[PDB]
Amino acid sequence: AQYEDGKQYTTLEKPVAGAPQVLEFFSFFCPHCYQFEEVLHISDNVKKKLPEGVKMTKYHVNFMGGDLGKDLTQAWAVAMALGVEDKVTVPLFEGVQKTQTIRSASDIRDVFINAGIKGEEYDAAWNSFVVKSLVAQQEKAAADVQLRGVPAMFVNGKYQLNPQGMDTSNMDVFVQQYADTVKYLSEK
Ligand SMILES: Cc1cc(Oc2ccc(CC(=O)N3CCOC[C@H]3C(=O)O)cc2)ccc1C#N
């Protein structure tokens, strides 16, 4: 078959119920995640191949980067709460992996300030129980699939994308195979 378990995707032994339709996990410390955002735009290209209604969810993980890694999961909850993911994703990636200017929680906050989030707005959100609950959701979702590596994408809590089983001589062909695979899995 053209799409095969073990090839473009794998099937979770214990599938998780009530999971978001398309769920990505990343870390701002994760080198392939940097590529998936800045060079490949995986999330955008997947979204372009799915129906207009479908929901895509993207969550940060704690297991890379120690204390700053957990700060970043909380900051990502702030981003989701305020709806400013698109404004902060690139400068967070570059601050962690390119310019080495993100070394503390205050440095993370600077990125939001420079992106135009008001200081009181960020601090209030950072300390809010709405954001605490979003942190819990990010952790629960990774726990549900015993997540030990990123980037990762899961479809309907049942299938895990396997990019290592796709072709990578051509970056654009790779992205469309990935997106087309997500489409095939969503229609399963
Ligand atoms: C064109 C292109 C294709 C790519 O294909 C992939 C290759 C590998 C991965 C897996 C990954 O990152 N890991 C594996 C399990 O989780 C732990 C983590 C590790 O330990 O490294 C993901 C995608 C990557 C980058 C580019 C570019 N430019």
Side-chain angles (χ1 to χ4, degrees), residues 1-6 8-12 15-51 53-117 119-145 147 149-188:
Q2 300 279 348
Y3 293 99
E4 287 189 324
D5 188 289
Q8 296 99 322
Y9 69 96
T10 56
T11 300
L12 301 183
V16 317
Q21 307 171 277
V22 178
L23 177 60
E24 314 188 66
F25 293 100
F26 77 111
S27 174
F28 285 110
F29 285 91
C30 156
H32 280 130
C33 307
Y34 190 107
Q35 299 300 148
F36 269 35
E37 166 66 38
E38 295 224 350
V39 176
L40 303 181
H41 314 274
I42 289 288
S43 301
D44 284 359
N45 279 284
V46 169
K47 175 166 187 178
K48 286 160 159 135
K49 287 277 174 80
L50 306 184
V54 85
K55 172 157 70 62
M56 298 182 60
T57 303
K58 172 132 92 189
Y59 285 161
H60 198 265
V61 303
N62 290 339
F63 59 83
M64 305 186 64
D67 212 89
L68 258 204
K70 270 196 86 139
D71 277 320
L72 285 166
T73 300
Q74 185 159 354
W76 188 246
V78 170
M80 294 190 285
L82 301 173
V84 293
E85 298 97 315
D86 293 355
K87 293 176 175 172
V88 301
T89 283
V90 169
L92 285 171
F93 265 121
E94 300 194 347
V96 177
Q97 296 191 47
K98 184 182 165 182
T99 56
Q100 277 243 334
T101 46
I102 294 188
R103 300 194 296 280
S104 72
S106 177
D107 294 345
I108 292 163
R109 173 178 191 278
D110 285 344
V111 171
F112 288 75
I113 307 297
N114 177 68
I117 290 89
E120 206 280 312
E121 206 184 340
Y122 179 91
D123 294 341
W126 178 273
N127 295 294
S128 67
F129 287 87
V130 158
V131 155
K132 286 208 205 322
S133 157
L134 283 162
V135 170
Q137 289 173 237
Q138 293 183 90
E139 295 187 19
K140 165 158 196 315
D144 286 338
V145 308
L147 181 79
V150 284
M153 184 178 305
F154 299 85
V155 178
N156 284 312
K158 255 191 142 305
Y159 303 107
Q160 179 177 7
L161 272 295
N162 183 29
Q164 305 172 268
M166 320 174 190
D167 317 317
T168 72
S169 71
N170 186 297
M171 287 192 310
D172 304 313
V173 173
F174 169 74
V175 171
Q176 53 164 32
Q177 205 189 341
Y178 195 105
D180 286 345
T181 302
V182 181
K183 183 165 195 293
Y184 155 83
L185 290 171
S186 78
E187 302 162 349
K188 225 161 153 77

